[PDB]
Design an enzyme around this catalytic site. Structure first.
Site, PDB file in Angstrom:
ATOM      1  N   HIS A 191       0.656  -1.118   0.096  1.00  0.00           N
ATOM      2  CA  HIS A 191      -0.144  -0.203  -0.062  1.00  0.00           C
ATOM      3  C   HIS A 191       0.964   1.263   0.023  1.00  0.00           C
ATOM      4  CE1 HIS A 191      -3.651   2.218   1.541  1.00  0.00           C
ATOM      5  NE2 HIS A 191      -2.484   3.205   1.892  1.00  0.00           N
ATOM      6  N   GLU A 192       1.873   1.308   0.852  1.00  0.00           N
ATOM      7  CA  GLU A 192       2.680   2.787   0.954  1.00  0.00           C
ATOM      8  C   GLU A 192       3.745   2.816  -0.281  1.00  0.00           C
ATOM      9  OE1 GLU A 192       1.876   4.431   2.983  1.00  0.00           O
ATOM     10  OE2 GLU A 192       1.068   3.217   4.508  1.00  0.00           O
ATOM     11  N   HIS A 213       1.786   4.066  -3.240  1.00  0.00           N
ATOM     12  CA  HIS A 213       1.522   5.587  -3.036  1.00  0.00           C
ATOM     13  C   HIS A 213       2.580   6.345  -3.893  1.00  0.00           C
ATOM     14  CE1 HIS A 213      -1.982   6.494  -0.526  1.00  0.00           C
ATOM     15  NE2 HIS A 213      -1.539   5.675   0.565  1.00  0.00           N
ATOM     16  N   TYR A 242      -4.298  14.148  -2.965  1.00  0.00           N
ATOM     17  CA  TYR A 242      -4.613  13.459  -1.408  1.00  0.00           C
ATOM     18  C   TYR A 242      -6.165  14.156  -0.886  1.00  0.00           C
ATOM     19  CZ  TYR A 242      -0.420  10.680  -1.594  1.00  0.00           C
ATOM     20  OH  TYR A 242       0.714   9.963  -1.827  1.00  0.00           O
ATOM     21  N   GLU A 273      -6.204   6.219  -2.268  1.00  0.00           N
ATOM     22  CA  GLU A 273      -6.162   5.257  -1.147  1.00  0.00           C
ATOM     23  C   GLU A 273      -6.684   4.052  -2.049  1.00  0.00           C
ATOM     24  OE1 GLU A 273      -4.278   6.248   1.231  1.00  0.00           O
ATOM     25  OE2 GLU A 273      -5.749   4.416   2.078  1.00  0.00           O
ATOM     26  N   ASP A 323     -10.642  13.523   7.683  1.00  0.00           N
ATOM     27  CA  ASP A 323      -9.883  12.396   6.741  1.00  0.00           C
ATOM     28  C   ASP A 323      -9.571  13.132   5.280  1.00  0.00           C
ATOM     29  OD1 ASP A 323      -8.516  10.030   6.182  1.00  0.00           O
ATOM     30  OD2 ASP A 323     -10.501   9.020   5.509  1.00  0.00           O
ATOM     31  N   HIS A 367      -9.821   7.564   3.377  1.00  0.00           N
ATOM     32  CA  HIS A 367      -9.865   6.288   3.903  1.00  0.00           C
ATOM     33  C   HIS A 367     -11.210   5.681   4.038  1.00  0.00           C
ATOM     34  CE1 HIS A 367      -5.969   7.947   5.188  1.00  0.00           C
ATOM     35  NE2 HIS A 367      -5.266   6.613   4.867  1.00  0.00           N
TER      36      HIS A 367
HETATM   37  N1  LIG Z   1      -2.152   9.893   3.596  1.00  0.00           N
HETATM   38  N2  LIG Z   1      -1.171   8.843   4.455  1.00  0.00           N
HETATM   39  C1  LIG Z   1      -1.617   8.196   5.301  1.00  0.00           C
HETATM   40  O1  LIG Z   1      -2.857   8.496   5.871  1.00  0.00           O
HETATM   41  C2  LIG Z   1      -1.107   7.231   6.261  1.00  0.00           C
HETATM   42  C3  LIG Z   1      -1.770   5.869   5.908  1.00  0.00           C
HETATM   43  C4  LIG Z   1      -1.944   5.404   4.351  1.00  0.00           C
HETATM   44  O2  LIG Z   1      -0.834   5.057   3.647  1.00  0.00           O
HETATM   45  O3  LIG Z   1      -2.821   5.804   3.931  1.00  0.00           O
HETATM   46 ZN   LIG Z   2      -2.792   5.136   2.064  1.00  0.00          ZN
END
Ligand SMILES: NNC(=O)CCC(=O)O
Ligand SMILES: [Zn+2]
Ligand SMILES: [Ca+2]
Ligand SMILES: [Ca+2]
Ligand SMILES: [Ca+2]
Ligand SMILES: [Ca+2]
Length: 316
Positions: free
Chosen positions: A142-143, A146, A157, A166, A226, A231
């Site tokens: 997931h990371e 991004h 974002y 997301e 958020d 999310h």
């Molecule tokens: N924008 N990043 C976060 O909120 C950290 C968790 C994620 O990777 O979505």
């Molecule tokens: Zn994320």
């Protein structure tokens, strides 16, 4: 650093033994030279300054408790690199084999992980809500996804663009988890969330509403928390992706599944050819329909299933 490529062994957050690519020069470093321009893992030492120090070890064995988050961040970054290269012909997050950097032991009791524009960062969790977050392959992928998004579609974002951003990370995080083929599922974060509670997770793609996230556009969050629900409203797209792959009848709309590999091809093409920084959900549907058309033909089952899945979640 300059040195010779080596293979160490260690244990990850869940106690599993795995081999890791290291580099020797006086110490053994968490530097994998076998993938692109390298995968580098750093110790943030419970601080918030980044990246910290490149992880150094005296004997190339990584079995200490403190080592476990580093082992998994390093190993799962490698698996994610392999997924993008072997499955999508993409060389690292920028397509040009950019070095992949991760820091672990970020802060104290930190219940999160993130991509900061330049590298991945993992908290250890507080031991109750989370254990160290690099223990989840879906989290690591997931990371890193991004980073892929930032170099491709560039989805901003916030609001619907951010919810697509997301969902892309949850989709590819899940597809990487299936690629590695260890306890794969359509849930997010189950391997590191709530060590005291079995069978839960942070989000579900197959049934987002299990954890309160919307599974239909009519139920989207419209407020400002958020970053406009990135999310939260991701559940709408996650559900559509799940339906495309696995099929189902949802709010009375039937979807014939086409499988994970075709889901991945369609969404990877949408991400890299058609989405833009400000794409909304309706524009994602159009991008996915066009991608499936390019790959499989306008009269294909794959195109029909993309349309049914977006219909089922109320996205026209
Ligand atoms: N924008 N990043 C976060 O909120 C950290 C968790 C994620 O990777 O979505
Ligand atoms: Zn994320
Ligand atoms: Ca050691
Ligand atoms: Ca799993
Ligand atoms: Ca999972
Ligand atoms: Ca749990």
């Amino acid at each position: 650093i300059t040195g010779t490529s080596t293979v160490g062994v260690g244990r990850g957050v869940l106690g599993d033994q795995k081999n890791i690519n290291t580099t020797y020069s006086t110490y053994y470093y968490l530097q994998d030279n076998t993938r692109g321009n390298g995968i580098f893992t750093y110790d943030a030492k419970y601080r918030t300054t980044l990246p910290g120090s490149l992880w150094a070890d005296a004997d190339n064995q990584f079995f200490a408790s403190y080592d476990a988050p580093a082992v998994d961040a390093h190993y799962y970054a490698g698996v994610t690199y392999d997924y993008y290269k072997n499955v999508h012909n993409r060389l690292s997050y920028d397509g040009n084999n950019a070095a992949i950097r991760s820091s672990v032991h970020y802060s104290q009791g930190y219940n999160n992980a993130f991509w900061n524009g330049s590298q991945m960062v993992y908290g250890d969790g507080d031991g109750q809500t989370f254990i160290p977050l690099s223990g989840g392959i879906d989290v690591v992928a997931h990371e890193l996804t991004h980073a892929v998004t930032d170099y491709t579609a560039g989805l901003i974002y916030q609001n619907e663009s951010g919810a697509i951003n997301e969902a892309i990370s949850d989709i590819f995080g899940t597809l990487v988890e299936f690629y590695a083929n260890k306890n794969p599922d359509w849930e997010i974060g189950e391997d590191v969330y709530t060590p005291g509670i079995s069978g839960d997770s942070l989000r579900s793609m197959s049934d987002p509403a299990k954890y309160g996230d919307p599974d239909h556009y009519s139920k989207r969050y419209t407020g400002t928390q958020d970053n406009g629900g990135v999310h939260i409203n991701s559940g709408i797209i996650n559900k559509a992706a799940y339906l495309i792959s696995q099929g189902g009848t949802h709010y009375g709309v039937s979807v014939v599944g086409i499988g994970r590999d075709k889901l991945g091809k369609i969404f990877y093409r949408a991400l890299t050819q058609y989405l833009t920084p400000t794409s909304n959900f309706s524009q994602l549907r159009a991008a996915a329909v066009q991608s499936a058309t390019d790959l499989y033909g306008s009269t294909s089952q794959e195109v029909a299933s993309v349309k049914q899945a977006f219909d089922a979640v109320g996205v026209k």
